[PDB]
């Protein structure tokens, strides 16, 4: 039915809101006009200020054990985490699999990882 086209990142409501209006008869199209879908989502995000697909190496500042873990976020029930010490490069990279129902303990660093699983499946 009625559909507007998500002027910035706040008004997206699925893949039917990323269309946008077409170009006119004479002007060259800008990327704000015609781009649709995931590319339009990334463009609208980068024009708002944020960038989606949050890529960042995880916080290995503190160690963190079972009184207060290292909290990681995932949209699924598991997230593969490669621990590399209490500094950034202390011991060699050991891969752990923290899931929704079990913490992940490093066995060489000693740090633990626990999720706040966002989910919404």
Which residue ranges make up the site for Zn ion (CB under 5 A)?
A: 83, 106, 109
Is residue 111 a contact partner of residue 70, using CB atoms and an 8 Å limit?
Answer: yes
Task: Round to whole Å and give the CA distance between 66 and 12.
Answer: 38
> Is 109 known as a binding-site position?
yes
Among 50, 107, 116, 118, binds another protein (CB under 8 A): 107
Q: Which is nearer to another protein, 64 or 117 (CB)?
A: 64
Minimum Å distance from CB 117 to another protein?
23
Neighbouring C-beta atoms of residue 98, cutoff 10 Å? 24
Q: Which is nearer to another protein, 72 or 103 (CB)?
A: 103
Minimum Å distance from CB 94 to another protein?
12
> Nearest CA to 92 among 101, 83, 100?
83
**Residues in 44-83 at the binding interface with another protein, rule: CB under 8 A:** 65-66
Q: 27: alpha, beta or left, given left = phi > 0 and alpha = psi -120 to 50?
A: beta
Is residue 98 a contact partner of residue 78, using CB atoms and an 8 Å limit?
Answer: yes
> Is 106 known as a binding-site position?
yes
Residue ranges at the known binding site for Zn(2+): 83, 91, 106, 109
Residues that bind another protein (CB under 8 A): 65-66, 105, 107-108, 110
């Amino acid at each position: 039915p009625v559909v507007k086209t998500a002027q910035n990142l706040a008004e997206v409501n699925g893949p039917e809101t990323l269309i946008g209006p077409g170009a006119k008869e004479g002007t060259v199209p800008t990327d704000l006009d015609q781009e649709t879908g995931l590319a339009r989502l990334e463009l609208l995000g980068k024009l708002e200020g944020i960038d989606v697909f949050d890529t960042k190496p995880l916080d290995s500042s503190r160690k963190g054990t079972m009184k207060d873990p290292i909290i990681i976020e995932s949209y699924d029930d598991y997230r593969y985490v490669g621990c590399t010490g209490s500094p950034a490069g202390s011991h060699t990279i050991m891969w752990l699999k923290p899931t929704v129902n079990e913490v992940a303990r490093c066995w060489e660093c000693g740090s633990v990882y626990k999720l706040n699983p966002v989910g919404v499946p």
